[PDB]
Symmetry: D2
Subunit: 333 residues, 4 copies
């Protein structure tokens, strides 16, 4: 129950291991499952187009990685129920494949002899945790838990702060979001999301996301009160979420900013800036969300007020630092 | 009827002004261009376009002109508009596309230089400002200097107008996810006093101020002071999209918003409609100023509190230019 | 008026149809096979990130596309031997999937009832045609033919002219090549080519190509004289091929250029330019190769001389016009 | 000497400071000249699109930056004449504006009271240093010296090693090169050069470079033996140079790679890799040049032999490391 396996050694999977080693975690990654050879997983861990060289040694054998001198078994089981997690005693699986985003599906890791699963994505009605918003809802008896999306991790601490300070009566969100591997390099079939079939680095691409709609799992009072969507655009990582709200009180911009500032104080998960940053400045962030005071906008006509608030997020590494906080707590229950 | 035009600033917008005029076989002839460079360079840029490809007509040049589709066009290189020799070829209406004369005070220099009227391809303060097929009926014979606002305004205005007319907009805020432009930076480095504009445009999402919502009263007077907004500049070369979040004057469904918008786009050469799952590159070369996208419409309601998000695409280069040219053609016949 | 089937309606497959309709070809495309529904293929045909809206109407039914009012059967058979090509009498298959690049594999289209197959890629030791270089080697007995890569179609007309005018003693090629669907959007496994696993829009990526090595299939006398490779870079289409040769004769730049110009005169496949063009200027090219006199370079020391020649190609549409020319001829034999 | 001015606080200028600080140099930057406000230079230093957050604290006043608690004056003089280098005690001027690339032009820095100038670019016929190739050519009487281009620092070490082991009889280079500030963001005039007028992030753009032409200043025996050019491509930083040589001996690939390995052994300026890297893996390199053994290629037809050797380079930071290496030495004579 400090021994971990990773299913899906992709962008998130590899950064999970990077982060665990960065914080000198007591968690022990003993096994990795993907679809490929150790050779290829080794090369991918060693060379990262977004974060540069792996800061530890990486080698491999025909069935393992050796990362900073320590051996990690590598399996290639496309069906999670066949992953031999018991061989090295992997107890908590960090599920990062995208193919097991529900209770029913991730049960397969427990049938395969793990005790717990932390899914790196929304997964329906199950405990969904944004760290430093609702991580106190985790419980010793939880075996399958979600950390939602990157987008949820960015939205939630902002929504929580506005909710606690002013009340959110209704709101809508748009994230301007880096492209991800669910999109396409060249125009071509991508299941049945038509917009996902289009070349991701050459287009602005609207895309659905549940971040707003499922916010009730993280902040129950906001349940049903938000909606939203993304526009996927050609940056490799680093994204930004705008929320437009009718609040429960009349406010000034200074007041909103000051409230947010207070909520980020002593908060390892939720950062604040008033610097004129742009997306690349978020890359490598150790926050799940960085509230940007410079973009706060209050639109007012007589009685009526609309409030736009904006937070940056590194949808890869930043979200990953959240996934790890949640994992470290999950392992100790 | 005024047939003869001068283009000042033969840049992204100015070159496409020519392109579009020839494409529609306008009776308007471009008789002179002014910029800061040589005919050879302007001819190279006209002939080869990174966004729309090869010019569809022949391009050659001489020491002091361009020859385009067989027709000669004078080239001047006067950085101050008052010195442009517009009377040599009888340039009557100036399409002002440099970014440097974005006021009545500034653009009236073209009149001092012998022109009769000026059409500014950008916002230009509190002057007559036209979005074609929203408020072009406010143009008259006494208008001598006119603005066509920003392409962001040409996107926002028709959408806002349809909504104003059908339901009312009590208050709204806009964000445009906007293609990068020449006002931005290639590599991180100073760009006047806007810190964000200093950053590498093709490697960043860059918040950016725009006045499209702020100054919407110039085009739709009843919405004056009711809208704000900003842009997120992103790494696409052209093609942009504008989201507006409104409190409307009436309780609505999405279907009802989409139908109202559809009716407003019917027989409207400036304002298109789509319910297809398009992306920004599908808007490149659009002949509309704005294309409303029914697939992105969103009603968020809790009790009596309702937010409505409406979304419209626009090719901030060519699509905008089609609107500029519609306004120009009308301007010239008043 | 021969009837054609297209296997693989991808970047090349869809542009094959676009080019046939553009030239008002007598060929009728009567069937398409891919892996997806008519609706997704209709979406992709209609909307193209590189070439804009389809110039003809496009609709679909549950088993067909309707393109400019003509019906094209759609099938979804991953094994070519199950494609019912006889149902609409497809007699020439344009093979564009990447999965049948040999005589032995493409035979499966003849087993399934077609008479000939034109493969849109290198396919080993078979007749391999670059139109206007070696198309006269085609005859009434050929049933399986390749058109090589777009790179071969760029390289061969330049090499052929140099060969004919000066002799090429030895040469090496580098193509700075737009990224394609064989690469990856984000860092992730891509078969066994390590470099192909890396984010294509964010890197310069060395990549092997057979264009130089197998050039002898197209220009027998240059067999074994050339090698080369690619650097894949972040442009969506539009590519350029450099060739550094030792020629059989001492030359000037002007002399090299005049010879190429001659070879491009009344040559619908091979253009010339002495304009300072860049890669977006080649997009939509109706040539397989455009020679660029501005980039010619003669480096000489004593009796020694290196000659660099450079030519542009739209690896998508330009190549496709070559493929269609070859197809037009192959259908008349 | 230990007191430096930087004229041109641009991509190179800022990184010069970053690198000095990273190596705990005993050299101290005491003044900076550019064309803007300390506020804007501070924003630029702190927030870097290529290298992320500055690793030391940055603040400013109306006449200064404060970097890691020390004060650095800031001037805004359009003409080097007018810079009070004297005031703050600026001995050596790192000239990084691109506007003073000759001995005569850089004279101003000495007229305004600096003792030496080190120019960050080629600067006509003057002492031009690639560190660990010809820095032994520097003496105490040197006042204005060049470190040439990024491309020169890539080409020179590789060329040097080949020349020492085998002889280069003639060669031509192509660098596939990240776009830089001399190019355009959108299509528009950029002085006389037509190709530089074109949108840099949307195009492959041929472009002249003197690296090969002027190699004689760094490696005198190669004077007039090399030529070359660049293809600028849409990556922000990270480049690669291919050189095709006729050597003075017959060689194998293994033999060429071992000679280069030897030349890179305990060579802090000149690295080696046999890993399958791509450009982004070079970002942040502490080498001026990294020879890539995986791309070596030998084309032999009897006595004739073309040898292609390929080296990577971070045209920003990698080049900067060499610039600082040279500076440290220049400052102690
Ligand atoms: N990229 C982001 O911005 C981001 C942020 C937060 C959460 N997420 C979520 O995390 C998950 C992974 O995202 P990603 O960007 O790392 O995806 P990715 O495509 O980079 O990685 C997926 C990995 O899973 C492997 N894989 C696929 N199917 C498999 C199977 N059946 N068994 C084992 N391995 C399999 C792939 O080979 C790959 O290495 C998704 O659920 C995604 O929604 C992504
Ligand atoms: N690009 C867009 O998306 C877009 C859309 C709508 C409106 N606009 C507006 O249109 C105008 C032009 O935009 P652009 O994108 O074409 O910019 P641009 O930089 O491409 O073009 C400006 C042109 O004007 C020339 N120029 C500069 N100063 C001059 C002077 N004093 N005299 C003569 N010529 C001069 C330049 O040499 C260049 O050719 C701006 O006002 C801009 O806000 C731009
Ligand atoms: N630059 C280019 O894109 C280019 C140029 C010249 C040649 N080629 C060659 O043309 C061929 C296609 O290239 P592309 O870029 O069009 O690739 P692509 O990936 O865009 O297209 C492949 C298409 O084939 C389908 N497909 C995959 N497996 C299949 C199967 N078993 N049966 C039926 N359909 C299947 C896919 O669904 C897809 O639509 C390849 O051999 C490639 O080397 C490509
Ligand atoms: N970027 C590279 O890859 C690279 C590599 C090696 C060498 N170089 C060379 O280094 C030099 C700088 O290149 P860069 O990429 O840093 O350029 P850049 O354009 O990023 O920076 C130049 C800086 O100088 C300033 N400037 C311009 N004229 C000035 C003046 N008269 N006085 C003071 N400041 C002035 C600008 O404001 C800017 O901050 C050039 O000579 C270039 O050839 C560049
Ligand atoms: O909001 C705006 O949108 P456009 O005129 O649509 O491009 C303007 O501020 C920006 O245009 P510009 O940057 O080319 O001047
Ligand atoms: O799920 C989290 C992020 O918002 C991105 O999603 P994706 O990688 O599944 O496309
Ligand atoms: O130039 C050759 C082709 O573009 C490469 O095709 P592929 O990479 O899609 O196989
Ligand atoms: O404006 C300056 C560029 O960033 C410098 O690099 P370059 O001269 O090598 O193009
Ligand atoms: Cl929603
Ligand atoms: Cl004036
Ligand atoms: Cl505003
Ligand atoms: Cl804008
Ligand atoms: Cl088969
Ligand atoms: Cl080869
Ligand atoms: Cl290739
Ligand atoms: Cl040269």
């Amino acid at each position: 129950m400090s021994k971990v396996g990773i299913n899906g050694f992709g962008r998130i999977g590899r950064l999970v291991l990077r982060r665990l080693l960065e914080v000198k975690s007591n968690i022990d990654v003993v096994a990795i499952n993907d679809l490929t050879s150790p050779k290829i997983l080794a090369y991918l861990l060693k060379h990262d187009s977004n974060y540069g060289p792996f800061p530890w040694s990486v080698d491999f054998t025909e069935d393992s990685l050796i990362v900073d001198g320590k051996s990690i078994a590598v399996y290639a089981e496309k069906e999670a129920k066949n992953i031999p997690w018991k061989a090295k005693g992997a107890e908590i699986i960090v599920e990062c494949t995208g193919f097991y985003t529900s209770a029913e599906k991730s049960q397969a890791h427990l049938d395969a002899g793990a005790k717990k699963v932390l899914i790196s994505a929304p997964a329906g009605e199950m405990k969904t945790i944004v760290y430093n918003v609702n991580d106190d809802t985790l419980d010793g008896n939880d075996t399958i838990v979600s950390v939602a999306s990157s987008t949820t991790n960015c939205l939630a601490p902002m929504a929580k702060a506005l909710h606690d300070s002013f009340g959110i009566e209704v709101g809508t969100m748009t994230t301007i979001h880096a492209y991800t591997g669910t999109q396409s390099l060249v125009d071509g079939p991508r299941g049945k999301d038509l917009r996902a079939s289009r070349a991701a680095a050459e287009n602005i691409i609207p895309h659905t996301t549940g971040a707003a709609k499922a916010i009730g799992l993280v902040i129950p009072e906001l349940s049903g009160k938000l909606k939203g969507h993304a526009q996927r655009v050609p940056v490799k990582t680093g994204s930004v979420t705008e929320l437009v709200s009718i609040l429960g009180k009349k406010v000034t911009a200074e007041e909103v900013n000051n409230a947010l500032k207070q909520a980020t104080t002593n908060n390892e998960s939720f950062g604040y800036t008033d610097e004129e940053i742009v997306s690349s400045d978020i890359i490598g962030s150790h926050f799940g969300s960085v509230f940007d005071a410079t973009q706060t906008e209050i639109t007012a006509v007589g009685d009526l007020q609309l409030v736009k608030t904006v937070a940056w997020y590194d949808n890869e590494y930043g979200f990953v630092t959240q996934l790890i906080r949640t994992l470290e707590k999950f392992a100790k229950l």
